Nucleic acid binder design. Structure first.
Ligand SMILES: [Mg+2]
Ligand SMILES: [Mg+2]
Length: 670
RNA sequence: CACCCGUGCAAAAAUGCAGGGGUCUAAAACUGAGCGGAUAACCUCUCUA
RNA sequence: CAUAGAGAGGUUAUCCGA
């Protein structure tokens, strides 16, 4: 947009006045004008970024000075929703939660629209921590190849946990057996950074107490991120100073290892939040660590800039005691950029190079009953980062069976540019681009011991791992969207409840929030109220104020059923859709995009689990089309995507392609 | 090529034109893709000792 | 099966890089 090119950073309504900010150093925002009614007021006299061409209640026109001269217009926030039609009034968020959010974080509602932006940034911090903690937990569950991991409480210490071995309660006995089945697993070496200690050039598995406290911290972070648990648990992440000493010690050693590797400040004074973030990073791919840490840096810097602007205006800003964490956001920003100066992808163990041999041999389906050939293949595979980011997220035999799904590899090869494909093909098999793609796909699907200087083998091996890496990473990044979606459902349910909406229990039925917002109710499990405009005009948020999307969300929700939506929720939140890729991707006639692939996986998982069960006739028709057409059904997607109705933009983005992926826009339907 | 909002001109309650949105979406700017040279460390054969 | 430079290749902190 040209407004940003003109340098108007933000527009802040305060009372009957609006303030306009400029782009300063980094994300610093310097105030420029205080436009009261229709009156000019210079607030900065040194290098003013822009000047006001004309001031009108409709909008303010500005011309850039620092950059290439460009004139733009900025709409008045005071009259955001008051137009043709109370003309001037501070706007509110689309979800109509602004007063509740302000009264949650601050002691009172505020007559401005600055605070809500800080709040939304904090709320985005929690979303990104939710996704990355669920990816960590999934990696660990994959390793086990699961209630134990999902139910980890910080309060419970190791001294209490070990008692469960002696205990007679069957669930507690299983809670301990699942722990003793995790010390080994012949896969714990994957996360050596957080599971092994250096103590002749050798390392050893850490003491059980520290492995437990690592796992406890990560499980608690994940569960707290997803469920937004009530009581004192809600403040947990913003009050880690109260952690048990054992978790402080564990965090201290884990974060201190890089420092002893490099000397940057020791863990003795870096905050527990930063150390917990680093611990979370230990389980992620490098791309995920970078996205996490940069989004944290961005949001904390925004928070700092808003707090500075509020302090310059003289607004009251002191957080309630339970959120006084954010008063330190300057230091947590400094610590996050310090971490970002040295964080690296989590190493494999140099000794486990001999333990991993069967996994490497499995991925390629290369197994029998000279040794040098297999050793060469294995060691050439194991060192590649496309292995480290694959066996941590998929079972090797499951990947090898998935690679037989010819249309999925054919699709992924259709995404690679013609030049890259030519290069690979001329390395791998020394005639048209699509015929070449087809043949390469066939080669990948029939990999065997025929590979046996004439060194062809590196070309074919590096191709295969790259195709499977791209496929699995895309499916994980699709899953992340619905994970964020359910996180938002479970948070906004509680926020609406605190605003006084009769939302009720969300775990009983995940569509309860969208129905509470729409004002419909269930009797005998059926929505007997037909569409009428008054229900849209009375809808509790701006998204559902429109007639046609109320009508559409109603018609889709009426043909949902509770069991399917709950099974979908748990399929997303445990990533079972990809964990059973072998059977879900079994029979796909044609793959159109990663969205169609992911929803085919989910719908085939549902069709497997509901094979012999109660099933509503709408679900039965969807499954019948999912069989008759060997591809995902769009209608079914809408049915199990209903709980996200409250946010129309989210709902639409997650239910038709072309709106799904920012990078692959395309035609929408109807 | 999504949503919401402002403003101007047709019109019968809607459409075309031009913009804005950290307070919409993973989504305020500040991108990404693929790749051509360094030092060292790094294991894997494959050579003989 | 020890331990003895050159050999051949993979991988890792950064531009000259569709
Ligand atoms: Mg929300
Ligand atoms: Mg989850």
């Amino acid at each position: 947009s040209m407004a940003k090119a003109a340098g108007v950073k933000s527009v802040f309504a305060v009372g009957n006045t609006v303030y306009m900010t400029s782009f300063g150093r980094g994300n610093d925002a310097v105030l420029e004008q205080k436009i009261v009614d229709t009156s000019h007021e210079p607030l900065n006299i040194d290098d003013p970024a822009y000047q006001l061409n004309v001031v009108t209640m409709n909008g303010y026109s500005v011309t850039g000075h620092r950059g290439e001269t460009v004139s733009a217009v900025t709409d008045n926030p005071l009259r955001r929703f008051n137009g043709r039609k109370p003309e001037q009034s501070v706007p509110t968020d689309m979800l109509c939660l602004k007063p509740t959010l302000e009264k949650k974080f601050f002691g009172k509602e505020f007559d401005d629209n600055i605070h809500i932006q800080l709040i939304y940034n904090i709320l985005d911090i929690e979303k990104i921590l939710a996704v990355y903690s669920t990816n960590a937990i999934y990696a660990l569950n994959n390793m086990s190849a699961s209630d134990f991991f999902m139910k980890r409480t910080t309060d419970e210490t190791f001294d209490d946990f070990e008692k469960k071995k002696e205990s007679t309660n069957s669930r507690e006995k299983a809670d301990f057996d699942a722990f003793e089945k995790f010390i080994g697993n012949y896969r714990l070496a994957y996360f050596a950074d957080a599971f092994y200690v250096n103590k002749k050039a050798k390392n050893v598995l850490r003491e059980d107490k520290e492995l437990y406290s690592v796992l406890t911290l990560i499980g608690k972070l994940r569960h707290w991120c997803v469920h937004s648990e009530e009581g004192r648990a809600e403040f947990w992440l913003y009050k880690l100073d109260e952690l048990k000493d054992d978790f402080k010690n564990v965090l201290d050693v884990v974060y201190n290892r890089p420092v002893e590797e490099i000397n940057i400040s020791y863990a003795d004074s870096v905050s527990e939040f930063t150390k917990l973030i680093y611990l979370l990073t230990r389980f992620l791919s490098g791309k995920e660590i970078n996205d996490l840490v940069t989004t944290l840096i961005n949001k904390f810097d925004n928070i700092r800039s808003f707090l500075e602007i509020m302090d310059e205006l003289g607004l009251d800003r002191t957080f309630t005691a339970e959120y006084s964490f954010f008063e330190g956001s300057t230091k947590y920003l400094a610590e996050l950029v310090e971490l970002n100066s040295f964080v690296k992808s989590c190493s494999f163990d140099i000794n486990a190079k001999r333990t991993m041999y069967r996994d490497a041999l499995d991925i390629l389906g290369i197994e029998s009953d000279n040794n040098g050939l297999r050793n060469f293949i294995a060691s050439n595979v194991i060192d590649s980062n496309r292995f480290k980011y694959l066996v941590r997220y998929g079972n090797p035999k499951k990947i090898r069976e998935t690679a037989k799904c010819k249309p999925a590899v054919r699709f992924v090869l259709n995404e690679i540019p013609d030049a890259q494909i030519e290069r690979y093909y001329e390395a791998c098999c020394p005639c048209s681009a699509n015929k070449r793609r087809e043949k390469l796909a066939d080669m990948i699907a029939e990999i065997k011991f025929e590979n046996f200087i004439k060194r062809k083998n590196q070309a074919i091996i590096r191709l295969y791992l790259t195709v499977m890496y791209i496929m699995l990473k895309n499916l994980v990044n699709v899953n992340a969207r619905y994970v964020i979606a359910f996180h938002c459902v479970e948070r906004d349910t509680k926020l609406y409840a605190e605003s006084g909406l009769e939302v009720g229990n969300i775990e009983k039925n995940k569509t309860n929030l969208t129905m509470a917002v729409m004002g419909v109710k269930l009797e005998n499990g059926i929505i007997k109220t037909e569409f009428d405009k008054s229900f849209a005009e009375n809808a509790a948020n701006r998204y559902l104020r429109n007639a046609r999307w109320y009508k559409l969300i109603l018609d889709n929700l009426k043909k949902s059923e509770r069991a399917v939506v709950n099974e979908f929720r748990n399929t997303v939140c445990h990533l079972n859709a990809i964990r059973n890729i072998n059977i879900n991707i079994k029979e796909i006639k044609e793959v159109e995009n990663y969205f169609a692939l992911y929803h085919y996986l989910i719908q085939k998982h549902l069709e497997n689990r509901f094979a012999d069960k109660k099933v509503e006739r709408d679900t039965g028709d969807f499954i019948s089309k999912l069989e008759e057409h060997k591809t995902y059904c769009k209608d079914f997607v809408k049915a199990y995507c209903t709980p996200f109705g409250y946010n129309l933009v989210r709902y639409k983005n997650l239910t038709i392609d072309g709106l799904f992926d920012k990078n692959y826009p395309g035609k929408d339907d109807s």
